[PDB]
Design a protein around this ligand. Structure first.
Ligand SMILES: [Cu+2]
Ligand SMILES: [Cu+2]
Ligand SMILES: [Zn+2]
Ligand SMILES: [Zn+2]
Lengths: 151, 151
């Protein structure tokens, strides 16, 4: 059995679709069926905490902030590619959103297992992801726009 | 060492960029640096023959036709996902082209080895790729728009 995760828009709070997670011999496949997102490539990662709630810093609200940082069980403390080991295991390939706001292209994360995903959050960012902390920390994804908690 | 492949637009014959091929523990990474392509997702596959020349059928010219069909050394005779074994080993993840005609997002083909790629062609299609022969044969990629021969 695969897993289905419901995704929610952090600004309006409305649902934007689902992501199907599937265990394959080469890793976990993420098949999205999302709508209402801005066209373009978006940073897509697994975050530490199983929460999509916001958090605060200096009295400012941070949407999706409760999810914490990137899933990084080996304590690499660095952002990278989905196919490099010295970086966050939660680093997924960027998610493509078409001109009409639809996300339907599946991507593979070869370092992950479906089992370990439970209890973490799937996050989609405003910006893209160049898979590096240079020139922008965490791939330049920026704000969190949509989030979902796995299982 | 990685491999660099030069890509050429089949209609005008001009170069559109390069693709860097790299062997990784999880498969081969294709990092494109292309321009002048139509925005959207494009079918992206490895074809049998090491040629980007055209071919003819019923006296009609078929651009890129000399490359033959999809690389399929196990004779599966079916189009599928980059992470399923019962289909063409030349089936790569779809290539994303931004609003400005640039392709710079890397993708991983976990079933391939850099070694076996030599002598085949990399092809980009007009249409997309749903990784199935349904409802359209070969994922609905259609015409061949850009092509390059590996090594
Ligand atoms: Cu993130
Ligand atoms: Cu093809
Ligand atoms: Zn990361
Ligand atoms: Zn195929």
């Amino acid at each position: 059995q695969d897993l289905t995760v419901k995704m929610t828009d952090l600004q309006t709070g409305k649902p934007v679709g689902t992501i199907e997670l599937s265990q394959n011999k080469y890793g976990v496949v993420f098949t999205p069926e999302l709508a209402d997102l801005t066209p373009g490539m978006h940073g897509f990662h697994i975050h530490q905490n199983g929460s999509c709630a916001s958090s605060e810093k200096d009295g400012k609200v941070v949407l999706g902030g409760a999810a914490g940082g990137h899933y990084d069980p080996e304590h690499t403390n660095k952002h990278g590619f989905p196919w490099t080991d010295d970086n966050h295991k939660g680093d997924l390939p960027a998610l493509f959103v078409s001109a009409n706001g639809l996300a339907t292209n599946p991507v593979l994360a070869p370092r992950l297992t479906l089992k370990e995903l439970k209890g973490h959050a799937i996050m989609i960012h405003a910006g893209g992801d160049n898979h590096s902390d240079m020139p922008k920390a965490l791939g330049g994804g920026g704000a969190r726009v949509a989030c979902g908690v796995i299982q």
